[PDB]
Coordinates of C-alpha atoms and ligand atoms in Angstrom, one line a residue:
Chain A
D28 CA 130.5 96.1 123.2
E29 CA 127.3 94.3 122.1
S30 CA 127.3 96.6 119.1
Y31 CA 130.1 94.6 117.7
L32 CA 127.9 91.5 117.6
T33 CA 125.5 92.3 114.8
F34 CA 125.2 91.6 111.1
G35 CA 127.3 93.4 108.5
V36 CA 127.7 93.4 104.7
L37 CA 130.8 92.3 102.9
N38 CA 130.9 92.6 99.1
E39 CA 133.1 89.5 99.0
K40 CA 134.3 86.8 101.4
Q41 CA 137.5 87.9 103.2
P42 CA 139.9 85.0 104.0
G43 CA 141.2 85.5 107.5
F44 CA 138.2 87.6 108.6
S45 CA 136.1 86.2 111.4
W46 CA 133.4 88.5 112.8
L47 CA 133.6 86.6 116.1
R48 CA 137.4 86.9 116.5
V49 CA 137.5 90.6 115.5
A50 CA 134.6 91.7 117.7
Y51 CA 136.2 90.1 120.8
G52 CA 139.7 91.4 120.1
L53 CA 141.2 88.0 119.5
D54 CA 142.3 89.4 116.1
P55 CA 144.6 92.4 116.8
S56 CA 144.4 93.8 113.3
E57 CA 143.3 97.4 113.4
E58 CA 142.4 97.3 109.7
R59 CA 140.1 94.3 110.3
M60 CA 138.4 96.1 113.2
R61 CA 137.8 99.0 110.7
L62 CA 136.4 96.5 108.3
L63 CA 134.1 95.0 110.9
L64 CA 132.7 98.4 112.1
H65 CA 132.4 99.6 108.5
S66 CA 130.4 96.6 107.3
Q67 CA 128.0 96.8 110.3
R68 CA 127.6 100.6 109.8
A69 CA 126.9 100.1 106.1
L70 CA 124.1 97.6 106.8
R71 CA 122.5 99.8 109.4
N72 CA 122.8 102.8 107.1
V73 CA 120.6 101.2 104.4
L74 CA 117.7 101.6 106.8
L75 CA 118.8 104.7 108.9
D76 CA 119.7 106.8 105.9
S77 CA 116.0 107.1 105.0
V78 CA 115.1 109.0 108.2
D79 CA 115.9 112.6 108.9
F80 CA 116.2 112.3 112.7
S81 CA 116.3 116.1 113.2
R82 CA 112.6 115.9 112.3
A83 CA 111.9 112.9 114.5
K84 CA 111.1 112.8 118.2
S85 CA 110.5 109.3 119.4
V86 CA 112.0 105.9 118.3
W87 CA 110.7 102.4 119.3
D88 CA 113.0 99.4 119.1
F89 CA 110.5 96.5 119.6
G90 CA 113.3 94.0 120.2
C91 CA 116.2 95.9 121.5
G92 CA 118.5 93.2 122.9
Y93 CA 121.1 95.0 125.1
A94 CA 119.9 98.3 123.7
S95 CA 123.1 99.0 121.6
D96 CA 121.1 100.4 118.7
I97 CA 119.0 102.9 120.6
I98 CA 122.0 104.0 122.8
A99 CA 124.1 104.8 119.7
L100 CA 121.1 106.7 118.2
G101 CA 120.6 108.6 121.4
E102 CA 124.2 109.7 121.6
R103 CA 124.2 110.7 117.9
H104 CA 120.9 112.7 118.1
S105 CA 120.7 114.1 121.6
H106 CA 117.1 115.2 121.3
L107 CA 115.7 111.8 120.6
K108 CA 113.6 109.7 123.0
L109 CA 114.2 106.0 122.4
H110 CA 112.3 103.1 124.0
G111 CA 113.3 99.5 123.7
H112 CA 111.3 96.3 124.4
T113 CA 112.8 93.0 125.5
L114 CA 111.5 89.8 126.9
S115 CA 114.5 89.2 129.2
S116 CA 114.7 90.8 132.7
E117 CA 118.4 90.1 132.4
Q118 CA 118.9 92.2 129.2
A119 CA 116.5 94.8 130.5
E120 CA 118.4 95.5 133.7
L121 CA 121.8 95.3 131.9
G122 CA 120.6 97.7 129.3
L123 CA 119.5 100.3 131.8
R124 CA 123.0 100.0 133.4
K125 CA 124.7 100.8 130.1
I126 CA 122.2 103.7 129.8
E127 CA 123.0 105.0 133.3
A128 CA 126.8 104.8 132.6
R129 CA 126.3 107.0 129.6
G130 CA 124.0 109.6 131.2
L131 CA 121.2 108.7 128.9
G132 CA 118.6 108.0 131.6
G133 CA 116.5 111.0 130.7
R134 CA 115.8 109.9 127.1
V135 CA 116.6 106.2 126.6
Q136 CA 114.5 103.4 128.2
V137 CA 114.4 99.7 128.1
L138 CA 111.1 98.0 129.2
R139 CA 110.3 94.3 129.7
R140 CA 107.2 94.3 127.4
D141 CA 106.0 91.7 124.9
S142 CA 105.8 93.7 121.7
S143 CA 103.3 91.1 120.2
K144 CA 100.6 92.1 122.7
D145 CA 101.9 94.9 125.0
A146 CA 101.5 98.5 124.0
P147 CA 104.7 100.7 124.1
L148 CA 105.0 103.9 126.0
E149 CA 104.1 106.5 123.3
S150 CA 100.9 106.7 121.3
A151 CA 102.7 107.5 118.0
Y152 CA 106.4 106.9 117.3
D153 CA 108.1 108.6 114.4
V154 CA 110.4 105.6 113.8
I155 CA 110.0 101.9 114.7
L156 CA 113.1 99.7 114.4
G157 CA 113.0 95.9 114.1
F158 CA 116.4 94.2 113.5
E159 CA 115.8 90.4 113.3
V160 CA 113.0 90.6 115.8
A161 CA 109.9 89.6 113.8
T162 CA 111.5 86.3 112.7
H163 CA 111.5 85.2 116.4
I164 CA 107.8 86.2 116.9
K165 CA 105.2 83.8 115.6
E166 CA 102.2 86.0 116.4
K167 CA 103.2 88.4 113.6
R168 CA 99.7 89.7 112.9
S169 CA 99.2 90.7 116.5
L170 CA 102.7 92.2 116.4
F171 CA 102.1 94.3 113.3
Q172 CA 98.8 95.5 114.6
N173 CA 100.6 96.7 117.8
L174 CA 103.4 98.3 115.8
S175 CA 101.2 100.1 113.2
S176 CA 98.7 101.4 115.7
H177 CA 101.6 103.1 117.6
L178 CA 103.3 104.5 114.4
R179 CA 102.7 108.1 113.5
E180 CA 100.9 108.6 110.2
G181 CA 103.7 108.8 107.6
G182 CA 106.2 107.5 110.2
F183 CA 108.9 105.0 109.4
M184 CA 109.1 101.3 110.1
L185 CA 112.6 100.0 109.5
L186 CA 112.9 96.2 109.5
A187 CA 115.8 93.9 108.9
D188 CA 114.4 90.3 108.6
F189 CA 114.4 87.1 106.7
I190 CA 112.2 85.9 103.8
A191 CA 111.7 82.2 103.2
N192 CA 112.1 81.0 99.6
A203 CA 113.5 78.5 116.6
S204 CA 112.8 81.2 113.9
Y205 CA 109.4 81.6 112.2
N206 CA 110.3 82.6 108.7
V207 CA 107.5 83.6 106.3
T208 CA 107.1 83.7 102.5
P209 CA 107.0 86.8 100.3
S210 CA 103.2 86.5 100.1
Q211 CA 103.0 86.5 103.9
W212 CA 105.1 89.6 104.2
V213 CA 102.9 91.4 101.7
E214 CA 99.8 90.6 103.6
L215 CA 101.4 91.5 106.9
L216 CA 102.3 95.0 105.8
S217 CA 99.2 95.7 103.6
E218 CA 96.7 94.6 106.3
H219 CA 98.0 97.2 108.7
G220 CA 98.4 100.2 106.4
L221 CA 102.2 99.8 106.0
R222 CA 103.5 101.0 102.6
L223 CA 106.9 99.9 101.4
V224 CA 109.1 102.7 100.1
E225 CA 111.9 100.2 99.3
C226 CA 113.2 96.6 99.9
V227 CA 116.9 95.9 99.7
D228 CA 118.3 92.4 99.4
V229 CA 121.6 91.9 101.3
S230 CA 121.5 88.1 101.4
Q231 CA 124.9 87.4 99.7
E232 CA 126.7 90.3 101.4
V233 CA 125.5 89.2 104.9
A234 CA 126.5 85.6 104.1
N235 CA 130.0 86.9 103.2
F236 CA 130.1 88.7 106.6
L237 CA 128.9 85.7 108.5
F238 CA 131.2 83.2 106.8
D239 CA 133.8 81.9 109.3
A240 CA 135.2 78.5 108.2
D241 CA 136.9 78.3 111.7
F242 CA 133.7 79.2 113.5
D243 CA 133.4 76.1 115.6
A244 CA 136.9 76.4 116.9
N245 CA 136.5 80.2 117.4
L246 CA 133.3 79.8 119.4
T247 CA 134.8 77.1 121.7
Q248 CA 137.8 79.4 122.3
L249 CA 135.4 82.2 123.5
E250 CA 133.6 79.8 125.8
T251 CA 136.8 78.7 127.6
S252 CA 139.0 81.8 127.3
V253 CA 136.7 84.8 127.8
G254 CA 133.5 83.1 129.0
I255 CA 130.0 83.4 127.3
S256 CA 126.5 83.4 128.6
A257 CA 124.0 80.9 127.3
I258 CA 122.0 83.7 125.6
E259 CA 125.2 84.8 123.8
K260 CA 126.2 81.4 122.6
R261 CA 122.7 80.7 121.3
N262 CA 122.7 83.9 119.4
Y263 CA 126.1 83.3 117.8
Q264 CA 125.2 79.8 116.7
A265 CA 122.0 81.2 115.3
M266 CA 123.9 83.8 113.3
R267 CA 126.1 81.1 111.9
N268 CA 123.2 78.9 110.9
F269 CA 121.6 82.0 109.3
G270 CA 124.7 82.5 107.2
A271 CA 124.4 78.9 106.0
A272 CA 120.7 79.3 105.1
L273 CA 121.7 82.5 103.1
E274 CA 124.5 80.7 101.3
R275 CA 122.0 77.9 100.5
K276 CA 119.4 80.5 99.4
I277 CA 116.8 78.9 101.6
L278 CA 116.3 82.4 103.1
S279 CA 116.9 86.0 102.0
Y280 CA 117.9 88.8 104.3
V281 CA 116.0 91.8 103.3
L282 CA 115.8 95.4 104.6
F283 CA 112.3 96.9 104.7
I284 CA 111.7 100.6 104.7
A285 CA 108.0 101.2 105.2
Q286 CA 105.7 104.0 106.1
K287 CA 102.3 104.1 107.8
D288 CA 99.8 105.2 105.1
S289 CA 96.1 105.2 105.9
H290 CA 95.1 107.0 102.7
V291 CA 96.3 104.7 100.0
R292 CA 93.7 102.3 98.6
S293 CA 94.1 98.8 100.0
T294 CA 94.3 97.1 96.6
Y295 CA 97.0 99.6 95.5
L296 CA 98.8 99.0 98.8
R297 CA 99.0 95.3 98.0
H298 CA 100.3 96.1 94.5
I299 CA 103.2 98.3 95.6
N300 CA 104.2 96.1 98.6
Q301 CA 104.2 93.1 96.2
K302 CA 106.5 94.9 93.8
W303 CA 109.1 95.5 96.5
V304 CA 108.8 92.2 98.3
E305 CA 109.0 90.2 95.1
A306 CA 111.6 92.5 93.4
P307 CA 113.9 94.0 96.1
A308 CA 116.7 96.3 95.1
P309 CA 120.0 94.4 95.1
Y310 CA 122.5 95.9 97.5
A311 CA 125.4 95.9 95.1
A312 CA 123.7 98.2 92.7
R313 CA 122.9 101.1 95.1
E314 CA 124.9 104.2 95.9
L315 CA 123.1 107.1 97.7
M316 CA 126.0 109.4 98.8
Chain B
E29 CA 82.1 113.3 79.2
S30 CA 85.1 114.7 77.3
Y31 CA 88.8 114.5 78.3
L32 CA 91.5 116.7 76.8
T33 CA 94.2 114.0 77.3
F34 CA 95.3 110.9 75.3
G35 CA 94.4 107.4 76.2
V36 CA 96.1 104.0 76.5
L37 CA 95.6 101.2 74.1
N38 CA 97.2 97.8 74.9
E39 CA 98.0 97.2 71.3
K40 CA 97.6 99.0 67.9
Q41 CA 93.9 99.1 66.9
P42 CA 93.7 99.2 63.0
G43 CA 90.9 101.3 61.8
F44 CA 90.9 103.3 65.0
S45 CA 91.9 106.9 64.4
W46 CA 91.8 109.1 67.4
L47 CA 91.4 112.0 65.0
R48 CA 88.5 110.5 63.1
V49 CA 86.7 109.4 66.3
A50 CA 87.3 112.4 68.6
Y51 CA 86.6 115.0 65.8
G52 CA 83.6 113.5 64.1
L53 CA 84.6 111.7 60.9
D54 CA 83.8 108.2 62.4
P55 CA 80.2 107.5 63.6
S56 CA 81.1 104.1 65.2
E57 CA 79.8 103.9 68.7
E58 CA 82.2 101.0 69.6
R59 CA 85.2 103.1 68.6
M60 CA 83.8 106.1 70.5
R61 CA 83.5 103.8 73.5
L62 CA 87.1 102.6 72.9
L63 CA 88.3 106.2 72.9
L64 CA 86.6 107.0 76.2
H65 CA 87.6 103.8 77.8
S66 CA 91.3 104.3 76.8
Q67 CA 91.1 107.7 78.4
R68 CA 89.5 106.5 81.6
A69 CA 92.1 103.7 81.9
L70 CA 94.9 106.2 81.7
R71 CA 93.7 108.4 84.6
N72 CA 92.4 105.4 86.6
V73 CA 96.0 104.1 87.0
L74 CA 96.5 107.3 89.1
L75 CA 93.1 107.6 90.7
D76 CA 92.9 104.0 91.8
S77 CA 95.8 104.6 94.2
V78 CA 93.8 107.0 96.4
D79 CA 91.2 106.1 99.0
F80 CA 88.8 108.9 98.2
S81 CA 86.5 107.9 101.1
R82 CA 89.4 109.2 103.3
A83 CA 90.0 112.4 101.4
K84 CA 88.1 115.6 101.8
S85 CA 89.6 118.0 99.3
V86 CA 90.9 117.7 95.7
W87 CA 92.7 120.3 93.5
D88 CA 92.8 119.9 89.7
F89 CA 95.2 122.6 88.7
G90 CA 94.4 122.1 85.0
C91 CA 90.9 120.9 84.9
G92 CA 89.9 121.3 81.2
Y93 CA 86.2 120.8 81.0
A94 CA 86.1 119.6 84.6
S95 CA 85.0 116.1 83.7
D96 CA 87.4 114.5 86.2
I97 CA 86.3 116.5 89.2
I98 CA 82.7 116.1 88.1
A99 CA 83.1 112.3 88.0
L100 CA 84.8 112.3 91.4
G101 CA 82.1 114.6 92.8
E102 CA 79.3 112.4 91.6
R103 CA 81.3 109.4 92.8
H104 CA 82.1 110.7 96.3
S105 CA 79.3 113.0 97.6
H106 CA 81.5 114.3 100.4
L107 CA 84.4 115.6 98.3
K108 CA 85.1 119.2 97.7
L109 CA 86.8 119.7 94.3
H110 CA 88.4 122.8 92.8
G111 CA 89.6 123.2 89.3
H112 CA 91.8 125.8 87.7
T113 CA 91.9 126.6 84.0
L114 CA 93.2 129.4 81.8
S115 CA 90.3 129.0 79.4
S116 CA 87.1 131.1 79.9
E117 CA 85.3 128.8 77.5
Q118 CA 86.3 125.6 79.4
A119 CA 85.4 127.2 82.7
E120 CA 81.9 128.4 81.6
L121 CA 81.2 124.9 80.0
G122 CA 82.4 123.1 83.1
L123 CA 80.4 125.4 85.5
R124 CA 77.4 124.8 83.3
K125 CA 77.9 121.1 83.6
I126 CA 78.4 121.5 87.3
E127 CA 75.1 123.4 87.8
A128 CA 73.2 120.9 85.6
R129 CA 74.4 118.2 88.0
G130 CA 73.5 120.2 91.2
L131 CA 77.2 120.1 92.2
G132 CA 77.6 123.9 92.5
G133 CA 78.3 123.7 96.2
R134 CA 81.1 121.1 96.3
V135 CA 82.7 121.7 92.8
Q136 CA 84.3 125.0 91.8
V137 CA 86.0 126.0 88.6
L138 CA 88.1 129.2 88.5
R139 CA 90.1 130.9 85.7
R140 CA 93.4 131.1 87.6
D141 CA 97.1 130.5 86.8
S142 CA 98.2 127.5 89.0
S143 CA 101.9 128.5 88.5
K144 CA 101.5 131.5 90.8
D145 CA 97.9 131.9 92.0
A146 CA 96.9 130.2 95.3
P147 CA 93.9 127.8 95.3
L148 CA 90.8 128.2 97.3
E149 CA 91.9 125.9 100.2
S150 CA 95.0 126.1 102.3
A151 CA 95.7 122.4 101.9
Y152 CA 94.4 119.6 99.7
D153 CA 94.3 115.8 100.2
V154 CA 94.8 115.2 96.5
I155 CA 96.2 117.3 93.6
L156 CA 95.5 116.2 90.0
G157 CA 97.6 117.2 87.0
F158 CA 96.8 115.3 83.8
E159 CA 98.8 116.7 80.9
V160 CA 99.0 120.1 82.6
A161 CA 102.6 120.6 83.9
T162 CA 103.9 120.1 80.3
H163 CA 102.1 123.4 79.3
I164 CA 103.6 125.4 82.2
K165 CA 107.1 127.0 81.8
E166 CA 107.9 128.2 85.4
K167 CA 107.7 124.7 86.8
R168 CA 109.7 125.5 89.9
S169 CA 107.1 128.2 90.7
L170 CA 104.3 125.7 89.9
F171 CA 105.6 122.9 92.1
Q172 CA 106.2 125.3 95.0
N173 CA 102.6 126.4 94.7
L174 CA 101.3 122.8 94.5
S175 CA 103.5 121.5 97.3
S176 CA 102.7 124.4 99.6
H177 CA 99.0 123.5 99.4
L178 CA 99.4 119.7 99.7
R179 CA 98.7 118.1 103.0
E180 CA 101.5 116.1 104.6
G181 CA 101.1 112.6 103.2
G182 CA 98.7 113.9 100.6
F183 CA 98.8 112.8 97.0
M184 CA 100.0 114.4 93.8
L185 CA 98.8 112.6 90.7
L186 CA 100.5 113.6 87.4
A187 CA 100.3 112.5 83.8
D188 CA 103.2 114.2 82.0
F189 CA 106.1 113.7 79.6
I190 CA 109.8 113.0 80.1
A191 CA 112.2 114.3 77.5
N192 CA 114.8 111.7 76.8
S204 CA 104.6 122.5 75.4
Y205 CA 107.8 122.4 77.5
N206 CA 109.2 119.0 78.2
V207 CA 111.5 118.1 81.1
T208 CA 114.5 115.8 81.4
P209 CA 114.7 112.9 83.9
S210 CA 117.1 114.9 86.1
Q211 CA 114.8 117.9 86.1
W212 CA 111.9 115.8 87.3
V213 CA 114.0 114.3 90.1
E214 CA 115.0 117.8 91.3
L215 CA 111.5 119.4 90.9
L216 CA 110.0 116.6 93.0
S217 CA 112.7 116.2 95.6
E218 CA 113.4 119.9 96.3
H219 CA 109.6 120.4 97.0
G220 CA 109.3 117.4 99.3
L221 CA 107.5 115.2 96.9
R222 CA 108.2 111.4 97.1
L223 CA 107.2 109.1 94.2
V224 CA 105.3 106.1 95.4
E225 CA 105.4 104.8 91.8
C226 CA 106.0 105.8 88.2
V227 CA 104.2 104.0 85.4
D228 CA 105.4 104.1 81.8
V229 CA 102.5 104.2 79.3
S230 CA 104.6 105.4 76.4
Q231 CA 103.9 102.6 73.9
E232 CA 100.2 102.5 75.0
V233 CA 99.8 106.2 74.3
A234 CA 101.7 105.7 71.0
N235 CA 99.1 103.0 70.2
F236 CA 96.3 105.4 71.0
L237 CA 97.9 108.0 68.6
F238 CA 98.8 105.6 65.8
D239 CA 97.0 106.3 62.6
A240 CA 98.3 104.8 59.4
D241 CA 96.0 107.1 57.3
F242 CA 96.7 110.2 59.4
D243 CA 97.6 112.5 56.5
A244 CA 94.6 111.3 54.4
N245 CA 92.2 111.5 57.4
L246 CA 93.5 115.0 58.3
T247 CA 92.6 116.2 54.8
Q248 CA 89.2 114.5 54.8
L249 CA 88.7 116.3 58.2
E250 CA 90.0 119.5 56.5
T251 CA 87.4 119.6 53.7
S252 CA 84.2 118.2 55.5
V253 CA 84.8 119.8 58.9
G254 CA 85.9 123.3 59.9
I255 CA 89.3 123.1 61.6
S256 CA 91.3 126.3 61.2
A257 CA 95.1 126.1 60.8
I258 CA 95.7 126.3 64.5
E259 CA 93.9 123.1 65.2
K260 CA 95.3 121.3 62.2
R261 CA 98.9 122.1 63.4
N262 CA 98.0 120.9 66.9
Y263 CA 96.5 117.7 65.3
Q264 CA 99.8 117.2 63.5
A265 CA 101.8 117.8 66.6
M266 CA 99.9 115.1 68.5
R267 CA 100.6 112.6 65.7
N268 CA 104.3 113.5 65.9
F269 CA 104.1 113.2 69.6
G270 CA 102.9 109.6 69.2
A271 CA 105.8 108.8 66.8
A272 CA 108.3 110.4 69.3
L273 CA 107.0 108.0 71.9
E274 CA 107.7 105.1 69.6
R275 CA 111.2 106.5 69.0
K276 CA 111.6 106.8 72.8
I277 CA 112.9 110.4 72.6
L278 CA 109.9 111.1 74.7
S279 CA 108.2 109.1 77.5
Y280 CA 104.6 109.4 78.7
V281 CA 104.7 108.7 82.4
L282 CA 102.2 108.6 85.3
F283 CA 103.6 110.0 88.6
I284 CA 102.0 108.9 91.9
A285 CA 103.7 111.1 94.4
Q286 CA 103.2 112.0 98.1
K287 CA 104.1 115.0 100.2
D288 CA 106.9 113.7 102.4
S289 CA 108.8 116.2 104.6
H290 CA 110.4 113.6 106.9
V291 CA 112.4 111.5 104.5
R292 CA 116.1 112.5 104.4
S293 CA 116.8 114.6 101.4
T294 CA 119.6 112.2 100.2
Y295 CA 117.2 109.3 100.3
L296 CA 114.3 111.3 98.7
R297 CA 116.6 111.8 95.7
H298 CA 117.5 108.1 95.5
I299 CA 113.9 107.0 95.6
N300 CA 112.7 109.6 93.1
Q301 CA 115.6 108.8 90.8
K302 CA 114.7 105.1 90.9
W303 CA 111.1 105.6 89.7
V304 CA 111.9 108.2 87.1
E305 CA 114.8 106.2 85.6
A306 CA 113.1 102.8 86.0
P307 CA 109.3 103.3 85.9
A308 CA 107.0 100.3 86.0
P309 CA 105.9 99.2 82.5
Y310 CA 102.1 99.4 82.1
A311 CA 101.8 96.0 80.5
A312 CA 103.4 94.1 83.5
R313 CA 101.0 95.6 86.1
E314 CA 98.4 93.3 87.7
Ligands
LIG1 N1 107.9 89.3 121.4 C1 108.9 90.1 121.8 N2 108.7 91.3 122.4 C2 109.7 92.1 122.9 N3 111.0 91.7 122.6 C3 111.3 90.5 121.9 C4 110.2 89.7 121.5 N4 110.8 88.6 120.9 C5 112.1 88.8 120.9 N5 112.4 89.9 121.5 C6 113.8 90.5 121.8 O1 114.6 90.5 120.7 C7 115.9 90.4 121.1 C8 116.7 89.5 120.2 S1 116.3 89.5 118.4 C9 116.8 91.2 118.2 C10 118.2 91.6 118.6 C11 118.5 93.1 118.3 N6 117.9 93.5 117.0 C12 120.0 93.3 118.4 O2 120.7 93.4 117.3 O3 120.6 93.4 119.4 C13 116.0 89.9 122.5 O4 116.4 91.0 123.4 C14 114.5 89.6 122.8 O5 114.2 90.0 124.1
LIG2 N1 99.3 127.8 84.1 C1 98.1 127.2 84.2 N2 97.2 127.4 85.2 C2 96.0 126.8 85.3 N3 95.6 126.0 84.3 C3 96.5 125.7 83.2 C4 97.7 126.4 83.2 N4 98.3 126.0 82.0 C5 97.5 125.1 81.4 N5 96.3 125.0 82.1 C6 95.1 124.1 81.8 O1 95.5 122.8 81.8 C7 94.7 122.1 80.9 C8 95.5 121.1 80.1 S1 94.6 120.0 79.0 C9 94.2 118.9 80.4 C10 92.7 119.0 80.7 C11 92.2 118.1 81.8 N6 93.3 117.8 82.8 C12 91.7 116.8 81.1 O2 92.1 115.7 81.6 O3 90.9 116.8 80.2 C13 94.0 123.1 80.0 O4 92.6 123.1 80.4 C14 94.5 124.4 80.4 O5 93.5 125.4 80.5

């Protein structure tokens, strides 16, 4: 169910569409449910389409939430081992419950580990996922040292995060130094700022949120995430932030000066989402 | 020493004639230094991407007079470097330069056909191809032989032409790279800069002054004309001179490999806007 509570991309604003109402079934429209799931799948696929998971063994989600992402990957590719890190003992035990109910206990794990300073289970992951996690970590240099040192050579880091133009948002120059100092080479950056803003736009958001608080009930962690998502959409509309998808690879053999060059190209000139079609 | 490629000039240099300088009509040392610097700058765009202190093995599958692998060998005393050529003369001259430098252990030059013949090592960290693939017809066979001896994550550095001597369309480049697991890190367009290197307003007069005071033969004179026409075709943009920085990547999804390779071949970085 938590998989319905993530970002998505809409090419234009849809009057009557409210990601909050649709995800919770308050909107009974089957076609709007299709739109919600499609827009969330389209955003995830920008990152996931780069990886041939038949040639991958281990995945690390270093801020997994309720582990919706790694559970879906585990059910889609039944050979994958997926590890998630979370700071919340609540989320950690609720995630393993969801994992138990789906018979995924042999492959999918959720650990209460601080990804900024705590090493994961595997020495080298083939894929590392970070969807809106680094923005909530201020010790980003310690974090990217931990991520890169546990990424296989040539392995993929797949980030969805914010660029500045309680979150700790950083500038394009700071992203370039983060990746370059730890041997991470961008294959592509994709800017989805406007399309995510369209997805997040709910002009009845305040009314819709209060309805969920009193008519279905909401935990404090959930209400804080929903209000954060709304404020993120406003920052995107105001162009204070960009939402960018990073596809990077661990590369220890490229010269450091060239690494900074090619990371700067992608960070300062990401591909616009509306111009891409991969098939 | 000597390079069998073009160079890059940031702008047109009047009075500079690649034909006069490289073939001994012009005694100016400054213009000879310009020629060599323009040629070093072209290949340095490719070479400066590789941390050679972390490489052990380099394959130049069209080494010419072996000047590149000799310069790399003197630069990095740990590297092993192997060059292929089809020219007995070039091989003997390169080997003689290698022996004069005391590089006979680490630097090898063989007369072998890179389109079908296996190199000395099973896998290389770096493969170099500066104006080589354009002269090879069975390119699918060539890229299979190159990719099969490239370490995972290893580099392939190519200076070649894109047809907008056997030139290859943008779509053919994307398929040649993608079907052999090669992923472009970057493409750099040096078309106008090579056109500047090859620009000579007095070409026809210089080629005649080179024809009567130097021995040329008709084979060389026609090659010299073909190079001038190549420069003009770059100006007309029916041809592109492009530097490919590729890596062996067998883990990227094939669909995404084609997308990224198409992006760099269709939209390469202009040389003038690179810091
Ligand atoms: N330093 C850190 N180490 C491990 N997990 C962290 C972390 N900082 C934040 N997180 C985790 O990141 C999650 C929220 S931000 C990421 C949410 C996730 N991408 C999703 O879509 O579900 C929370 O579960 C929190 O525990
Ligand atoms: N099929 C083939 N196999 C091996 N070498 C080849 C080849 N086809 C062409 N060559 C070689 O590729 C070279 C092209 S001229 C390039 C020379 C060198 N790269 C330089 O920078 O100076 C020639 O030396 C030629 O002998």
